[PDB]
């Protein structure tokens, strides 16, 4: 109904109510999701740095690689256990199942995963790239340091860097979605100051 | 002021005026800048599609004068085909607003007259012309195999910058439509 009148003063408060609702239920949700994933990937970036001390030349001739997988497996698993309790959304407590499912679609099923903490749910960080690394590590043969000829170190590192490339692509699109979310908020502010 | 009454009908009109303004002043500006830069690179493929015939054994010999006549023609065709605005000029303050939005790597603020435009940054085309210079030669050059790889690597690096310059603009434009789409959605039903 277009005849419904509203004061300029009532309109200012309704705008400030909608803006605050958006920043609280959309902007700050997107920012913390980006926040949690960079810090997750930053800790994984610390394991790639420590990977240098876990790979040295080995073998009879010396062309091969001697990767201590137990040290690398230990670091990737501690990274998993660190972020079981650090979800993308929400930042505090839990929310309903459909609220966790609504923000799973908005963020992406690849980046996040809906989990129940008993009663309430969260959108936890999807650790599929890390878990894919661990089982490929688990299949390398032996339960310790493995001598990897350049042909089969070629195959493992190609898949290891791919799961690393996945988390970067995941972080890139999460950063881009937050960039557009801030731009939608910015435009939504200018469109409403247009009324006065 | 604060006590003046407004109808829901008047609010719809003030919002439709802004969505129209955003389409004319933001989306269609992106649509033209993407197209104008796309036409240039598609024309740059000329010096590219002719590179194979301009290379032959000598060592390696390269027709630099032909490789240079075509690049200097590419700058002439887009000397006055700017990225923003599509027509006439704008303010310099208005032009710098879009130079930052599109990045100083693809745009370049120029003073056409009293007004300003954001022209296409032909620095990669300039970069290749200056290294085609340093090669020397009467009009055709014969190069050591070590330069031809050194030169062809840096030349293809300038083409790779224009390729990444284009798709970066293509994704910035597609994200602009994504912002406009969701901007209407939350406004269509707040």
Author numbering:
A (entry chain B): 124 to 319
B (entry chain A): 124 to 181, 187 to 318
Publication passage describing the model:
Studies in Shigella have demonstrated that bile salts found in the small intestine (e.g., deoxycholate (DOC)) interact directly with the injectisome tip complex protein invasion plasmid antigen D (IpaD) to support interaction with the hydrophobic translocator protein IpaB and its stable recruitment to the maturing tip complex. In Shigella, IpaD resides at the extracellular tip of the injectisome where it functions as a “gatekeeper” that prevents unwanted protein secretion (leakage) through the injectisome prior to requisite activation events. Here, we uncover critical mechanistic details of the Shigella-specific DOC signaling process by describing the role of a π-helix secondary structure element within the T3SS tip protein invasion plasmid antigen D (IpaD).
A small number of groups, including our own, have crystallized IpaD and IpaD mutants and while some full-length IpaD structures have been solved, proteolytic cleavage of the N-terminal domain facilitates crystallization. Here, we mimicked the previously successful native proteolytic cleavage by engineering IpaDWT, IpaDΔQ148, and IpaDΔY149 to lack their N terminal 121 residues. Careful consideration of the WT structure suggested that the localized i + 5 hydrogen bonding pattern of the π-helix results from the “insertion” of an amino acid into this region and that removing either the glutamine at position 148 or the tyrosine at position 149 would eliminate the π-helix and return it to a continuous i + 4 hydrogen bonding α-helix. Notably, while very modest conformational changes are observed in the crystal structures as a result of DOC binding to either the IpaDΔ1–121, WT or IpaDΔ1–121, ΔQ148 structures, the removal of the π-helix in both the apo and bound conditions results in a lateral shift of the central helices relative to the WT structure, resulting in a 7 Å translation of the distal ends of the structures.
